[PDB]
Amino acid sequence: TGEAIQKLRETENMLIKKQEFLEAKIEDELNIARKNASKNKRVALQALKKKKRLEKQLQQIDGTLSTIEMQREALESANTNTAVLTTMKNAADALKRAHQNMDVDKVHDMMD
Numbered sequence: 001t002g003e004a005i006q007k008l009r010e011t012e013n014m015l016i017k018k019q020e021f022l023e024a025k026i027e028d029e030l031n032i033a034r035k036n037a038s039k040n041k042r043v044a045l046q047a048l049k050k051k052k053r054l055e056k057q058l059q060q061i062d063g064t065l066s067t068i069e070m071q072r073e074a075l076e077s078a079n080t081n082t083a084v085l086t087t088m089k090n091a092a093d094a095l096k097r098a099h100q101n102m103d104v105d106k107v108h109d110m111m112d
Helices: 004-036 040-107
Strands: none
Touching: 004 040
16 A cells, blocks of 8 residues: 555665665774774775775665665655546546536426
8 A cells, every 4th residue: 555655664764774884884994994004004905995895885775775765756656646536537527417417407408
């Protein structure tokens, strides 16, 4: 049902924690590199190597997140149309009754 939007959030919301988790570990690795940049090339390079891979995990979480967002915004659209189109036709039904009754009044005059 529309509850699908509920699972799209919470999913999206969990995905932001992953996103904030990576951003966290990225600056973490970065600060390791900073403090070992000149004193310890080995450790510094392991950091930048971990950082570069974390950043990659962040891109495809970003791309995935926006993908999630749009499907939520596609459900929202289709969810409103569901209401709009039912009242839209309900109206055209009522309107057709008006036009129908009119046509029956004319035929009722032919009864003379």
